[PDB]
Design a protein around this ligand. Structure first.
Ligand SMILES: N[C@@H](Cc1c[nH]c[nH+]1)C(=O)O
Length: 237
């Protein structure tokens, strides 16, 4: 293992990764990463990036790990390796309170839908919606999506369910918005929860992460950390 492990993350996805008022990194990803590093007995430097630059930066060795709500998908496994699951992550639509919008082509054709560049939601939205007449608009960071929704530039926005819920819907800025329909289920696109993204050849680093995460889950540190953010089981199955 390196003495310093460099972890990239996109700090605009509360409550998993964001910045406090002084610019320090906060969220459940941060806590998980810092707790794993503690147990791996390495130093960890967090590195902020747009989400869609994370996997390119990992391939170029500018970072060594990604902890950024990075969903474990089949396509991504072709390019990088993953730790064991850190938590589950369903996708879901948000729109203005009272809107009839559903995550269907029939409901969304002609409306403007925000998605994060590089995400599984952009992959899904591009294939099923954008080609068929939905104005799918891709954003560099998720904060910009929420803002464009509250200004009425967007009709709806597709992102991880818990990020939307805890990072926006339950905040003042999303008081007048809600989920539009239930979770969009599509195991192909959205993957099997999130994990630490790693280079394929870094078997020893993956092993160290996987073992730290088992240890912090076994002794109950996971749940203590998660209760700061969630009143439900974020881990899943
Ligand atoms: N979990 C999804 C959505 C996401 C946006 N930012 C971080 N994650 C993905 O890995 O693409």
């Amino acid at each position: 293992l390196p003495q310093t492990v460099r972890i990239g993350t996109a700090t605009t996805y509360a409550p998993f990764s964001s910045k406090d008022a002084k610019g320090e990194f906060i969220g459940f990803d941060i806590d998980l990463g810092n707790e794993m590093c503690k147990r791996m007995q390495v130093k960890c430097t967090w590195v902020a990036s747009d989400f869609d630059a994370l996997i390119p930066s990992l391939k170029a060795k500018k970072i060594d790990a990604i902890i950024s709500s990075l969903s474990i998908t089949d396509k991504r496994q072709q390019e990088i390796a993953f730790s064991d699951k850190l938590y589950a992550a369903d996708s879901r639509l948000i729109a203005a309170k009272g809107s009839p919008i559903q995550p269907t082509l029939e409901s969304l054709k002609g409306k403007h839908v925000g998605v994060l560049q590089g995400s599984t939601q952009e992959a899904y939205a591009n294939d099923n919606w954008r080609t068929k007449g939905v104005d799918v608009v891709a954003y560099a960071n998720q904060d910009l999506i929420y803002s464009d929704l509250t200004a009425g530039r967007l009709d709806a926005a597709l992102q991880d369910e818990v990020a939307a819920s805890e990072g926006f819907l339950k905040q003042p800025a999303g008081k007048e918005y809600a989920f539009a329909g239930p979770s969009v289920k599509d195991k192909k696109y959205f993957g099997d929860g999130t994990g630490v993204g790693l280079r394929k050849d870094d078997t020893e680093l993956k092993a160290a992460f996987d073992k730290a995460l088992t240890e912090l889950r076994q002794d109950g540190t996971y749940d203590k950390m998660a209760k700061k953010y969630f009143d439900f089981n974020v881990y899943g199955d």
